[PDB]
Design a protein around this nucleic acid. Structure first.
Ligand SMILES: [Mg+2]
Ligand SMILES: [Mg+2]
Ligand SMILES: [Mg+2]
Ligand SMILES: [Mg+2]
Ligand SMILES: [Mg+2]
Ligand SMILES: [Mg+2]
Ligand SMILES: [Mg+2]
Ligand SMILES: [Mg+2]
Ligand SMILES: [Mg+2]
Ligand SMILES: [Mg+2]
Ligand SMILES: [Mg+2]
Ligand SMILES: [Mg+2]
Ligand SMILES: [Mg+2]
Ligand SMILES: [Mg+2]
Ligand SMILES: [Mg+2]
Ligand SMILES: [Mg+2]
Ligand SMILES: [Mg+2]
Ligand SMILES: [Mg+2]
Ligand SMILES: [Mg+2]
Ligand SMILES: [Mg+2]
Ligand SMILES: [Mg+2]
Ligand SMILES: [Mg+2]
Ligand SMILES: [Mg+2]
Ligand SMILES: [Mg+2]
Ligand SMILES: [Mg+2]
Ligand SMILES: [Mg+2]
Ligand SMILES: [Mg+2]
Ligand SMILES: [Mg+2]
Ligand SMILES: [Mg+2]
Ligand SMILES: [Mg+2]
Ligand SMILES: [Mg+2]
Ligand SMILES: [Mg+2]
Ligand SMILES: [Mg+2]
Ligand SMILES: [Mg+2]
Ligand SMILES: [Mg+2]
Ligand SMILES: [Mg+2]
Ligand SMILES: [Mg+2]
Ligand SMILES: [Mg+2]
Ligand SMILES: [Mg+2]
Ligand SMILES: [Mg+2]
Ligand SMILES: [Mg+2]
Lengths: 62, 93, 77, 46, 102
RNA sequence: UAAGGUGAUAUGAACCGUUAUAACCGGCGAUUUCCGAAUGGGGAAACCCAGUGUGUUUCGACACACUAUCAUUAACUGAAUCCAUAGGUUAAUGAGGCGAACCGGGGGAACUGAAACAUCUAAGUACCCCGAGGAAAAGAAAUCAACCGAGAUUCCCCCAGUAGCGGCGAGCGAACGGGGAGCAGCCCAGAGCCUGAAUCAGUGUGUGUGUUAGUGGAAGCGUCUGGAAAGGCGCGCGAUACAGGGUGACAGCCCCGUACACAAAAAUGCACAUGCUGUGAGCUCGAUGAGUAGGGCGGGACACGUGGUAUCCUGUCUGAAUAUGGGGGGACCAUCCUCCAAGGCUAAAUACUCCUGACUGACCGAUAGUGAACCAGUACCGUGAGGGAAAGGCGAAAAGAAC
RNA sequence: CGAAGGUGUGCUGUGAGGCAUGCUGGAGGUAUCAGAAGUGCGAAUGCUGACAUAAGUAACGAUAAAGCGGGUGAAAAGCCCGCUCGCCGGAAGACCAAGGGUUCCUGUCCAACGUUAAUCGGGGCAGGGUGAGUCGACCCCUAAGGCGAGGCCGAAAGGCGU
């Protein structure tokens, strides 16, 4: 990501971000009920949402 | 009132125990761990949108984290918000 | 505070020297009086916390000059 | 018999609290020495 | 600038297994190296009921100090020393003996 | 910069990465809840409650931004009272608070010393308060000297425990002059002529250089004892490197280093070069700091305790001369010498160490050395200000003892 | 092929001491001559730590009071169950506020803690448990009192107050 995300328009980033949070909620909901085997996914989604929001902030006020 | 980014961050995990069971099987109430900052309205909203079910009423309570001693030094578990979400008679999940 | 708006005369410390030369700390307060002065140029009366020396300064320099200094100090009147 | 310490949290905070120390210059001088000594709790807080 | 790397043929200079040759299994932060078939230990591994796991005297390669191994110059059949240089736009290693790249 | 990684106790899990978005290191950005100057109002810190303005495939409530005080400036507005001034509102810019020592100022003890004690000492110390900077303060003679002369200030060594001061007691204690570190001079008190000409600060660019990551970095083998070799023995080799550390016992040649040789995309310190906004150079003719100098009174400061006591500061009362003039030369007068007060600025030598890097010690080695080698300003004590510990070592390797 | 330290021995010096050596230990010590001192301990009701003594002595915290059968357990006067007995009953019962902060409940464990045993516990460990329009707080309102734009006053710090 980061280069692949830098491309996409603001309207697009915000859409992807909604899916990221929707995924984050489900993955929380998985491990929560004791069903998530792939622990490392929680970290991934979280660190990706960060990139999105860093890119959104660099696009909006620059 | 609400937003999608917030409704997603609000619900955190479901809470299991013999009371969270009898609550479910005898009164159609789902016991949940919600964000400490989550209002009763924000839980109704999130449980209706993210779980697609009809919420009757939400009752909330804040649980105090237990303190454990390790000799001279102590530790304190985090404080959390428990949410009793009753649902209208058409039970699902 | 016991301060002359004109000269800047303030209380000083010294000693009460007895006949047996014993010294006990004391203050030497200035001769302060609040006095209304006539500003022809401003068509108003200005009250100033001034020393008796201060008055003699206003009598020489001229009220208009002395107030000019007060503006230059930021010291409102 | 009745001992010297009779607790009242309203009183405790209204007397030794952070806000209390913060009010006076000498109370501000207290917080200073505690921070300088490296105190864990500067005042009895929540 | 790491003289000994993963899956290198080395040769022991110090300790019980001095002279033995081996392939570098794993390298650790500690400045130590687990080398295949060197410095082995007969561990009395305790049983774990959460696997229902039996206990057993297990033999495993225990880490030797990276200063106790030298790089093996297969061509000279001798222990050697690594030196760095820039062949092209990339840094390389070479045997201090034959001045030849690895 | 890399072949290994996802901080520690602390494994395990699930994974990431190996020739270049794994990780790690450095520059610059993004984010940065709540409390705290804390600043929308309140408050028992980490909470409670608003106003205005915006947003609502829901335009309820929630989300978001703004809203403290003071100072200067600006715009509008505006009384007693006609003008005016006060007041009122908004906006812009600045301040606030924290913090080692050094520094300048405002206040200012006592215990003690005098073998008692009051003058005197301690001491302008301790402490409280205010303000500021990489230093601060001081600073270009109304200064000394002595009829020869010197030439701002700060600082060092002498002069000298001398001259003096002193219930002439206890004590306090200079200067002149000499040897040094360092050296630097200027502006206003106003007008014209020439005009932006010397200096300096803010700032863009460039170079040189320094900081914030880094790169390369020589030369060993046999044998003996031994669990193990760096130790014994034998023979080689490097050294602008034999500083130091680690490695299974003591290593120049196993590792990290060390001498030496290099390095920055970016941020920045300091210099010059250069551009620019602002400041003003040179010359002629002037001008030359007044409630001031001096004095009475009460104090304070000078090594100098009122003394025969100059010099300085001023609480109080008073008060000149104006270069044919005035200050000083330790009561005072005369002569002579010297200087020009009542306006300001100024680098260096000097003081310091919360902090960053390098190196060092006839300093300590766990009752020592920091209170603290260790999760210590902790545990614990106390209403609180505050007080305040004990506590290091298996082994080369956990092979931490299967059965 | 065994350093320092530890502990025996022997020889030696007038002595402080010195030397050698057995055992322990397991990496360090340092002649000689110089140089420098945190340089020698029995006392200071010395400081710190350790361990004696009295002594297996005094006590075991209200004189309301116990007895038995059964149980669990390695073990039972104390725990559980049962039947008796006794004590409080304007309290020794029930409920609040202040204060405490998980002590509540379940499982499990017994080193230490409990003045004894402990299977039991307010003890260890783990898990669970506190649900409000109408009960309390927040909120509106004020009291004593506090703070207080401007303000008045005060060497500074500050004091007072619209
Ligand atoms: Mg509730
Ligand atoms: Mg970075
Ligand atoms: Mg606020
Ligand atoms: Mg406030
Ligand atoms: Mg309010
Ligand atoms: Mg009018
Ligand atoms: Mg400040
Ligand atoms: Mg005396
Ligand atoms: Mg500063
Ligand atoms: Mg200065
Ligand atoms: Mg002359
Ligand atoms: Mg002196
Ligand atoms: Mg001289
Ligand atoms: Mg010179
Ligand atoms: Mg090398
Ligand atoms: Mg050894
Ligand atoms: Mg003059
Ligand atoms: Mg006389
Ligand atoms: Mg004079
Ligand atoms: Mg002058
Ligand atoms: Mg340092
Ligand atoms: Mg210590
Ligand atoms: Mg020891
Ligand atoms: Mg020694
Ligand atoms: Mg010896
Ligand atoms: Mg000697
Ligand atoms: Mg002794
Ligand atoms: Mg004795
Ligand atoms: Mg007995
Ligand atoms: Mg007896
Ligand atoms: Mg007896
Ligand atoms: Mg008895
Ligand atoms: Mg009893
Ligand atoms: Mg027993
Ligand atoms: Mg507990
Ligand atoms: Mg219980
Ligand atoms: Mg017991
Ligand atoms: Mg318990
Ligand atoms: Mg309800
Ligand atoms: Mg005020
Ligand atoms: Mg007040």
């Amino acid at each position: 990501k980061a280069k692949e995300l830098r491309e996409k328009s603001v309207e697009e980033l915000n859409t992807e971000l909604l899916n990221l949070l929707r995924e984050q909620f489900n993955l929380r909901m998985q491990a929560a009920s004791g069903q998530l085997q792939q622990s490392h996914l929680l970290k991934q989604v979280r660190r990706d949402v960060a990139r999105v929001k860093t890119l959104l902030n660099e696009k909006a006020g620059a | 009132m609400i937003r999608e980014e917030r409704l997603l961050k609000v619900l955190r995990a479901p809470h299991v125990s013999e009371k969270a069971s009898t609550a479910m099987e005898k009164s159609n109430t789902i016991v949940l761990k919600v964000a400490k900052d989550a209002t009763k309205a924000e839980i109704k909203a999130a449980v209706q949108k993210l779980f697609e079910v009809e919420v009757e009423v939400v009752n909330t309570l804040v649980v105090k984290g237990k303190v454990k001693r390790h000799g001279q030094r102590i530790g304190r578990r985090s404080d959390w918000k428990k949410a009793y979400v009753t649902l209208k008679e058409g039970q699902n999940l | 505070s016991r301060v002359c708006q004109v000269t800047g005369k303030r209380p000083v410390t010294g000693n009460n020297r007895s006949h047996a030369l014993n010294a006990t700390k004391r203050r030497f307060l200035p001769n302060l009086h609040s006095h209304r002065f006539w500003v022809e140029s401003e068509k108003r009366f200005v009250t100033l916390r001034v020393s008796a020396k201060g008055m003699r300064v206003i009598d020489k320099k001229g009220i208009d000059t002395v107030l000019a200094e007060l503006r230059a100090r930021g010291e409102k009147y | 018999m009745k001992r010297t310490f009779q607790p009242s949290v309203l009183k405790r905070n209204r007397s030794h609290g952070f806000r209390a120390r913060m009010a006076t210059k000498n109370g501000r001088q207290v917080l200073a020495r505690r921070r300088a000594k490296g105190r864990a709790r500067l005042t009895v807080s929540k | 600038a790491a003289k000994i790397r993963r899956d290198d043929e080395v040769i022991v200079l110090t300790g019980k297994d001095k002279g033995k040759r081996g392939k570098v299994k794993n390298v650790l932060s500690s400045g130590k190296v687990i080398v295949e078939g060197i410095n082995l230990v007969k561990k009395h591994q305790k049983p774990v009921p959460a696997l229902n796991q039996p206990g057993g005297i297990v033999e495993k390669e225990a880490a030797i100090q990276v200063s106790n191994v030298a790089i093996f110059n297969a061509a000279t059949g001798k222990a050697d020393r690594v030196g760095f240089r820039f062949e092209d736009g990339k840094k390389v290693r070479f045997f201090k003996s034959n001045s030849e790249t690895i």
